[PDB]
Amino acid sequence: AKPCTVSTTNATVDLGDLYSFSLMSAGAASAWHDVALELTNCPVGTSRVTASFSGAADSTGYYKNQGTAQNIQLELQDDSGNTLNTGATKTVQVDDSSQSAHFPLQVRALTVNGGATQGTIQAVISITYTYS
């Protein structure tokens, strides 16, 4: 099927400042932060959009922090609590009243094993769309 227009080229999640004091214990984490991916002007005949997610993972399975803080990871979920680690896909239905599609996702930082250290948090997740 024909591709939609990708309205969301770029989407930034600002997790703010986390404190090593607060991230001493395993499983400590930031709040979830919403991030949306939007597609518009889907051709007639396009009824489903699949997003494929890719980014560097560490040995915890979650996304690697590519900033300087150690012992912290990034987690991407859908709207329903499902983890979308690298290689995951998600499919949504095109809304035929507007011929648009959306991916309501959420991101947080977490220290899987505890002991996050001072430094930056930086990560990027690439999305490729397929259509049917």
Binding site: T9, N10, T12, L15, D17, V107, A109, T120
Partner: peptide, 15 residues
């Protein structure tokens, strides 16, 4: 490729 999610923040240690 089609979209990029950028995640940014900081871990501060004031000890």
């Amino acid at each position: 490729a089609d979209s990029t999610i950028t995640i940014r923040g900081y871990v501060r240690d004031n000890r």
